[PDB]
Amino acid sequence: NVLTVYSPYQSNLIRPILNEFEKQEHVKIEIKHGSTQVLLSNLHNEDFSERGDVFMGGVLSETIDHPEDFVPYQDTSVTQQLEDYRSNNKYVTSFLLMPTVIVVNSDLQGDIKIRGYQDLLQPILKGKIAYSNPNTTTTGYQHMRAIYSMHHRVSDVHQFQNHAMQLSKTSKVIEDVAKGKYYAGLSYEQDARTWKNKGYPVSIVYPIEGTMLNVDGIALVKNAHPHPKRKKLVQYLTSRSVQQRLVAEFDAKSIRKDVSEQSDQSIENLKNIPLIPKSKLPDIPHHKFLEMIQ
């Protein structure tokens, strides 16, 4: 009896973690891959009997437009989760924290000042910075929410979109910035660090106006025959020892109170990041926000 997991994460990065669960619980996991929104849409158009069991990863509490596709579940670990990033919606369990960032090509930058979104509007940068399509990528979507949160003006989003090139994939932003095609781009910490660590001249900037923190989540999928091990998979992924392993192996921060941000790589501490005031984060459904800025 196969346990089926939807995940927007690259399989090569989640396989070691899930393989340990496979051994512990004597179950085979099958992973369906794609972008967050492709997976959510295919899941939506699947019959109950063909749906998988768990949606693992992605900013689910900001992108799920069909809560009816998921099963309310409150994880054992929630009382041990950071209070500010606890889901607040019954069908998502918060899992990891990931800052969105501006990436800057430090060879190209010279004397150009870039501390946040409004610096990206300088004339010297016109047409020479990049972001990813917010309608199809979670990273583009989150960045447009961040820009909207500065003054709650759609016109700020449109202004930025008249200054920056839109790319079809988030991975193209960091690659094209790293390789010198653009001065700067809108990305997220893991991608930025990945390419920085390859040796490219990538500087990481947390937008001073306000930095959007991605809360990745896990959700149980509503299907006809739920796998008996699926809740144990959620508990496993939010357990202290797995969360410790994720902070140590990735440029992500744990959702847990009792897990430290210390890790042998490059990472700023949350307390030093200029996060968007909570009373600023637009409380707008995914599809409605995209219609707002269309």
For 235, other C-beta atoms within 10 Å of its C-beta total 15
Is residue 214 annotated as involved in ligand binding? yes
Q: Is 119 flagged in the annotation as binding?
A: no
Query: Which residue in this structure is represented by tokens 């196969």?
Result: 2
139 in a labelled binding site = yes
**N-to-C CA span, the chain:** 44
Tokens of 96: 């990891």
CA–CA gap between residue 140 and residue 123 (Å, rounded): 22
36 is in an annotated binding site: yes
Contact 183, 104 (CB under 8 A): yes
- Other Cβ atoms less than 10 A from the Cβ of 54: the count is 23
Strands (E), the chain: 3-7, 29-33, 54-56, 70-71, 93-105, 129-132, 165-167, 184-188, 202-205, 213-221, 253-254
Q: What is the resolution of this structure in A?
A: 2.2
Q: E-strand spans in 108-248? A: 129-132, 165-167, 184-188, 202-205, 213-221
Note whether 113 and 125 are within 8 A (CB).
Answer: no
- Report d(CA 164, CA 273) in Å as an integer: 24
Q: Which experimental approach was used here?
A: X-ray
Q: Is 58 annotated as a binding residue?
A: yes
25 is written with which tokens? 């619980």
